[PDB]
């Protein structure tokens, strides 16, 4: 069981008797910590959902689809993840379009260490 | 002070010699936390009510018969093996050149505490004669000793007579006469004794 010092440290921002009354605050502290365990798990699901929405919106502006892009990347051996792809569509439109064109049309110029073999 | 000095402030016991007691009813995460490990309800979990031997009403232990045979009184004698008697002689704790009596056995340590007498039993292969006086003997011991040329005598002593045999100094230091020997034994014990013991035994050569 938490001590008085621990209980009141956790409950410093609670309302009414939940702030300074031990019996009321103790039950409010434990229930909140239970919410936090669930909250951390759900955070990872929600953020990935947001990335996909932004990628899909960018793809459809050019006439493409999210599912077509993911399949196309795996055929080209491109391993950029969704967090990076989401950020490219928002902040680097020109680079995001270049990735789409390579996947759809494959018209990029290859680079070799020895330019003149 | 150096590190190797010993004082009252750095003593500990040997590991494993002690273990902490279990104090129950002291928290959810403690051993035997809430209910003290007794369960939830019932007669067992309500204090001193039930004896550990009650079987529910069947009472199976008293469904067996009773025997009333009386064991022989000779279970009250101290038992001495012939093989143990020889070992003492070989080590030198007993003198085999003179008659051996129960007093010598008591002092040598063969017999621990005598209240009634000594019973001699067992088989042993001897090469030298032995003369021993005891209160009782079997047939295996008699044959073993006599085969080498010894003599086994069963001597009859009373309660007062046995005390004089074992602790004569207890009477001389107080200037008291020794107990007198018995006259004869009851005929019901015929075939149990060969002679009446003398409080000061007569030692002979072997």
């Amino acid at each position: 069981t938490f001590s008085r010092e621990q209980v009141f440290t956790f409950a410093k921002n609670f309302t009414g008797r939940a702030r300074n009354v031990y019996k009321v605050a103790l039950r409010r502290v434990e229930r909140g910590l239970q919410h936090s365990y669930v909250g951390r798990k759900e955070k990872k699901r929600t953020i990935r959902s947001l990335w996909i929405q932004r990628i899909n919106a960018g793809c459809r502006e050019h006439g493409f689809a999210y599912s077509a892009l993911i399949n196309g990347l795996n055929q080209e051996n491109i391993q950029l993840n969704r967090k990076v792809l989401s950020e490219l569509a928002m902040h680097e439109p020109d680079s995001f379009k270049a990735v789409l064109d390579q996947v759809r049309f494959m018209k990029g110029q290859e680079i070799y260490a020895n330019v003149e073999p | 002070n150096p590190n190797y000095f010993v004082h009252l402030g750095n003593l500990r016991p040997n590991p494993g010699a002690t273990q902490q007691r279990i104090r129950e009813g002291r928290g959810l995460s403690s051993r035997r936390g809430v209910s003290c490990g007794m369960g939830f309800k019932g007669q067992k979990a309500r204090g001193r009510s039930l004896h550990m031997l009650y079987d529910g009403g069947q009472l199976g232990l008293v469904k067996f018969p009773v025997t009333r045979q009386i064991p022989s009184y000779e279970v009250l004698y101290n038992q001495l093996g012939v093989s143990k008697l020889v070992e003492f002689i070989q080590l030198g704790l007993l003198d085999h050149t003179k008659t051996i009596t129960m007093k010598e056995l008591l002092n040598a340590g063969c017999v621990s505490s005598l209240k009634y007498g000594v019973l001699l039993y067992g088989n042993v292969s001897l090469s030298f004669p032995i003369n021993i006086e005891v209160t009782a003997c079997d047939d295996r011991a008699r044959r073993s000793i006599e085969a080498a040329g010894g003599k086994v005598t069963r001597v009859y002593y009373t309660k007062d007579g046995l005390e004089g045999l074992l602790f004569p100094k207890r009477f001389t230091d107080k200037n008291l006469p020794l107990p007198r020997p018995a006259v004869a034994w009851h005929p019901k014990f015929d075939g149990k004794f060969d002679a009446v013991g003398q409080i000061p035994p007569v030692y002979e050569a072997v």
């Binding site: - | 002070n1 150096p2 590190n3 190797y4 000095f5 010993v6 009252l8 003593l11 500990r12 016991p13 040997n14 010699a17």
Partner: protein, 202 residues
């Protein structure tokens, strides 16, 4: 941390209290003064001695020994209060103790052989630490307490400690010299004690 010869006899000089000078030399048996030091045996004997000295004159009162409390204080049913049977119950302020204290002894037993092992360990430890000294006598040539203190200080100058323990052959020993030593020793001396060899303990 240094080399020790176990079970070997020791040669120890003898000093004089009156002047602090060496007078002769003697020998210490190796089985008593050069034995192994058992740390666990010392712990057991120390606990054994402390338990024996505890007095144990302590008592409390339970609900049957507190004054009053015979009658039932409330009706069993109807009042809306908790059911109660007596005012001297442990649950009530001013009630009895659930498990009262009783006058008791705290002493337990040890074999006489284990006590011997402890004494040898303690004597051996002193010799290996250089805290053991032998003198011819304590009262010969000394007529004042200050004189004795100065002599003892000179003899034990090569040591780390401060307090001293003095062991003699008892009051009726050395021609009743012990009586003189007791008289000279001041009352309530916190750093000096005198014991007979019969009362030596770990």
């Amino acid at each position: 941390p240094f080399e020790v010869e176990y079970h070997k006899d020791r040669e120890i000089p003898v000093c004089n209290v009156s002047d602090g000078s060496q007078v002769s030399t003697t020998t210490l048996n190796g089985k008593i003064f050069s034995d192994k030091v058992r740390l666990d045996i010392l712990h057991t004997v120390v606990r054994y001695l402390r338990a024996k000295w505890q007095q144990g004159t302590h008592k409390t009162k339970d609900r049957s020994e507190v004054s009053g409390g015979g009658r039932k204080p409330r009706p069993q049913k109807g009042s809306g209060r908790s059911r109660q049977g007596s005012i001297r119950s442990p649950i009530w302020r001013g009630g009895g103790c659930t498990f009262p204290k009783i006058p008791r002894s705290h002493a337990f037993k040890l074999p006489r052989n284990v006590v011997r092992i402890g004494i040898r360990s303690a004597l051996s430890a002193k010799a290996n630490e250089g805290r053991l000294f032998v003198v011819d006598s304590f009262v010969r040539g000394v007529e004042s307490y200050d004189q004795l203190k100065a002599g003892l200080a000179e003899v034990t100058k090569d040591a780390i400690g401060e307090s001293l323990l003095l062991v003699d052959s008892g009051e009726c020993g050395e021609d009743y010299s012990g009586v003189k030593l007791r008289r000279l020793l001041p009352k309530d001396s916190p750093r000096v004690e005198v014991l007979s060899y019969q009362d030596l303990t770990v």
